[PDB]
Design a protein around this ligand. Structure first.
Ligand SMILES: Cc1cc2nc3c(=O)[nH]c(=O)nc-3n(C[C@H](O)[C@H](O)[C@H](O)COP(=O)(O)OP(=O)(O)OC[C@H]3O[C@@H](n4cnc5c(N)ncnc54)[C@H](O)[C@@H]3O)c2cc1C
Ligand SMILES: NC(=O)C1=CN([C@@H]2O[C@H](COP(=O)(O)OP(=O)(O)OC[C@H]3O[C@@H](n4cnc5c(N)ncnc54)[C@H](OP(=O)(O)O)[C@@H]3O)[C@@H](O)[C@H]2O)C=CC1
Ligand SMILES: Cc1cc2nc3c(=O)[nH]c(=O)nc-3n(C[C@H](O)[C@H](O)[C@H](O)COP(=O)(O)O)c2cc1C
Length: 635
């Protein structure tokens, strides 16, 4: 069952789609492509996670399997955790792929240095080892917001290739369900077998089982009690939540610098608009059971389950709407006036961007706009279950020290919310959940923009619990305690750096010998958004001369912006001194602008301090990144 060639033969499949995904986008695309390949070309598709197979025999693959690689790039041009073992095999163990027929679409972000490293590497290596590239390589730029149209253009070119080079008959797209739904009027919330949205099937029965003993991962969260929350900003319109999770009654462990994954539930406001949009507002307590119609289709949540539990706890109903979604559901348009508007919107890239994407409509608002508020009654819920991605966990840099508090996890989450002129709320799913927990836990008297279910399924989230798991990072304090470190992280970039500073403080407290710690921080205003403002003096008083903090208040003076890079330039001789002593550089926070500005600044200080050209210094800083002498936690 770990042999992907055997699994292809047993399920009578001729098309493999492999996804390398961290936050689900690559998965969704594998899934969309699969159905459209099957519908339009009659190919027998199977979507496979790299992590579910071993690849030692992959070179044995025969010419009758068309392979599609949908692969995202992470870390410093690293593969996604799921793809890591496949990445090792190809680069290190793979000999030939003489009869592989493949094509590759890479997901990346061009604000990052190693743009689509994994897409390009794979597309190259597979060709070098004898593979037949049946459709041109393409790739997506999540940095410019073109990723979704990028994938769409690639898919069009892959259809051209199949029709015109492999000489395949192309039929129109039609919904071909991989799953069958049956309403169970004989079943209700009273029945213990029925999911009210628990994270997995191990949380639904669970009488003679300890749900506090792990292992905990992306398949199995721990329910962690939030023992403390505070608002960290002083501004009425902008919010950042300090969260304390208690893991003391569990086997969940983290190391300083690791990520916490927080499993979301959707907002009341969003669920209402969804249920309205598809006329399900009378059906949310109706139980359904799902039965797979394809041998390789996994049902993506526990069954049986209520409509409302699927929508609240399993479907990514909020987020930008793919134009591909309009093309897939258009068949189910309520009336002919809708059909005319909808096939025109779905067929026009620019008009779709102007009328759907730029207005920040959720699926619900976009379909209700198109149909002039007629419900999309004829949409089988099965279509929705296949064509809307699983609600995936959001990652947070742990801001606690595992040496200082092995038993607590802190995160530092800035809240993303706006209100449209029409009155629509556009909300970050996880961040507004945390703002909500903070408002409720502290009886603050603020009025939530959106509301969530803080008791969760059958009151199993009661005591302000969320489902979490820890994901190990490479973002680690140096092995040798004495190695100096340079910590740069404005705004919520400070989160993991608080973790680092708290660790080194506990190390000095433990009579350990600790290197120089330099921290560059930035925020708008020392009175407004200075994260953990009062802790730093306390940390200073324990670290003594071995700690120095430089703070860039970007709006303190309205006429002149001041950023960390400015504070770095004016302390350049200290910075370079610490680099001469082997200091490790840690840059955390905004990927899109700060990370690159800071990298340039460090390059300039290297260039002057060692009398080499700026480009030679930039190449030297880039090699520090490959060696892990320069480490980034930027999102
Ligand atoms: C390794 C890593 C570490 C991180 N560390 C931190 C950290 O320490 N602190 C931190 O605050 N964040 C951190 N992040 C970011 C974090 O994972 C989340 O992306 C962030 O908190 C927002 O998640 P959300 O679920 O609240 O918003 P999401 O639900 O993901 O929404 C994303 C954005 O889209 C908007 N939006 C909603 N609907 C639409 C629509 N229809 N059209 C367009 N836009 C829409 C939302 O308002 C929001 O602004 C980290 C990310 C990574 C990858
Ligand atoms: O991040 P989040 O936690 O969301 O909060 P912010 O984005 O507000 O945090 C970023 C902080 O760094 C500043 N900043 C903005 N752009 C850059 C840049 N290119 N380089 C360095 N600093 C920058 C911001 O000042 P400002 O927002 O005033 O530009 C602010 O003080
Ligand atoms: C922490 C982090 C690091 C990233 N590093 C890179 C990178 O080095 N190169 C790149 O091209 N894209 C990078 N990206 C962009 C992702 O590849 C992109 O968001 C992708 O569309 C996500 O795919 P997934 O949801 O399937 O995991 C990074 C994104 C994040 C959040």
């Amino acid at each position: 069952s770990r042999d992907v060639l055997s699994t292809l033969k047993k399920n009578n499949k001729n098309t493999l789609l492999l996804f390398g995904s961290q936050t689900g986008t690559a998965e969704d695309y594998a899934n969309k492509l699969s159905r459209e390949l099957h519908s339009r070309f009659g190919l027998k598709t199977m979507v496979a996670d790299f992590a579910d197979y071993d690849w030692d025999n992959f070179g044995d693959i025969t010419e009758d399997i068309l392979v599609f690689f949908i692969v995202a790039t992470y870390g410093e041009g690293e593969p996604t955790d799921n793809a890591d073992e496949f990445h090792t095999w190809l680069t290190e163990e793979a000999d030939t792929l003489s009869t592989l027929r493949y094509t590759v679409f890479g997901l990346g972000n061009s604000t990052y240095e190693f743009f689509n490293a994994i897409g390009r590497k794979f597309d190259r290596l597979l060709s070098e080892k004898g593979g037949d590239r049946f459709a041109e390589y393409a790739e997506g730029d999540d940095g410019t917001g073109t990723l979704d149209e990028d994938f769409m253009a690639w898919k069009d070119n892959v259809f051209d290739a199949l029709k015109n080079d492999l000489n395949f008959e192309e039929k129109e797209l039609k919904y071909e369900p991989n799953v069958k739904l049956t309403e169970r009027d004989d079943l209700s919330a009273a029945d213990s077998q029925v999911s009210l949205g628990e994270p997995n099937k191990k949380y639904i029965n669970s009488e003679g089982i300890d749900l506090t003993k792990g292992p905990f991962d992306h398949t199995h969260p721990y329910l962690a009690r939030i023992t403390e929350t505070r608002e960290l900003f002083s501004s009425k319109e902008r919010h950042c939540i300090h969260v304390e999770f208690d893991i003391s009654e569990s086997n969940l462990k983290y190391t300083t610098g690791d990520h916490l994954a927080i499993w979301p539930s959707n907002s009341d406001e969003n669920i209402k608009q969804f249920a309205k949009c598809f006329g399900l507002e009378d059906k949310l307590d109706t139980v359904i059971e799902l039965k797979a119609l394809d041998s390789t289709y996994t049902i993506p949540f526990p069954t049986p389950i209520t409509y409302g539990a699927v929508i609240r706890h399993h479907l990514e109903i909020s987020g930008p709407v793919s134009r591909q979604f309009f093309l897939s559901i258009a068949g189910f348009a309520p009336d002919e006036e809708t059909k005319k508007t909808f096939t025109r919107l779905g067929g026009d890239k620019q008009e779709f961007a102007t009328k759907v994407t730029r207005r920040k409509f959720n699926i619900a608002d976009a379909l209700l706009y198109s149909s002039n508020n007629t419900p999309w009654s004829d949409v089988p819920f099965e279509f929705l279950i296949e064509n809307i991605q699983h609600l995936t966990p959001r990652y947070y840099s742990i801001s606690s020290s595992s040496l200082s508090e092995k038993q607590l996890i802190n995160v530092t989450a800035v809240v993303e919310a706006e209100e449209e002129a029409d009155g629509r709320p556009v909300t970050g799913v996880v961040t507004n959940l945390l703002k909500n927990i903070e408002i409720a836990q502290n009886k603050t008297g603020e009025k939530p923009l959106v509301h969530y279910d803080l008791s969760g399924p059958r009151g199993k989230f009661n005591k302000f619990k969320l489902p979490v798991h820890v994901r190990r990072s490479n973002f680690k304090l140096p092995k040798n305690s004495t190695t100096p470190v340079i910590l740069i992280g404005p705004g919520t970039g400070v989160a993991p750096l608080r973790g680092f500073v708290r660790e080194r403080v506990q190390q000095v407290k433990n009579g350990v010998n600790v290197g120089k710690t330099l921290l560059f921080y930035g925020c708008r205003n020392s009175n407004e958004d200075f994260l953990y403002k009062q802790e730093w003096a306390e940390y200073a008083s324990v670290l003594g001369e071995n700690f120095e903090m430089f703070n860039a208040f970007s709006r303190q003076d309205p006429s002149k912006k001041v950023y960390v890079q400015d504070k770095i330039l004016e302390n350049s001789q200290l910075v370079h001194e610490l680099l001469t002593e082997g200091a490790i550089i840690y840059v955390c926070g905004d990927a899109s602008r700060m990370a690159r500005d800071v990298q340039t600044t460090i390059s300039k200080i290297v260039a002057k301090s060692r009398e080499i050209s700026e480009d030679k210094a930039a190449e030297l800083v880039k090699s520090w990144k490959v060696q892990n002498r320069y480490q980034e936690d930027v999102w």
